[PDB]
């Protein structure tokens, strides 16, 4: 009946818009927290050579 | 929602592959100083069985 295509309709746009969030900086975090872990991850490479050779390693 | 279930997974991905390093020299040098060590020890006693006995002991 036309009355139950006057309700699918008036749900699709109920459900088409949810307050679809933004997902950017949730992921930065993430970027972030890895750039983080590798650094001071990176640290310990260079004192461990540093024990090595009395100096830390040359550039490149 | 199924653009969340797209960052975790893209969220997954990023934190599956932090640049894990090798945890193989960090422990020979560790082994290395061990047997360093025991030897230095083992000079001692030596040093000290000669002091004993005039000479140093035999073999096995």
Chains 1, 2 share one sequence.
Do not use: H, M
Not at 3 to 31: D, H, N
């Amino acid at each position: 009946t036309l009355i139950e295509l006057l309700i699918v309709v008036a749900i699709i746009g109920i459900l088409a818009a949810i307050a679809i969030p933004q997902f950017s900086a949730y992921r930065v975090k993430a970027y972030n927290s890895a750039a983080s872990s590798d650094l001071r991850n990176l640290k310990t490479a260079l004192e461990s050579a540093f024990a090595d050779d009395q100096t830390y390693p040359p550039e490149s």
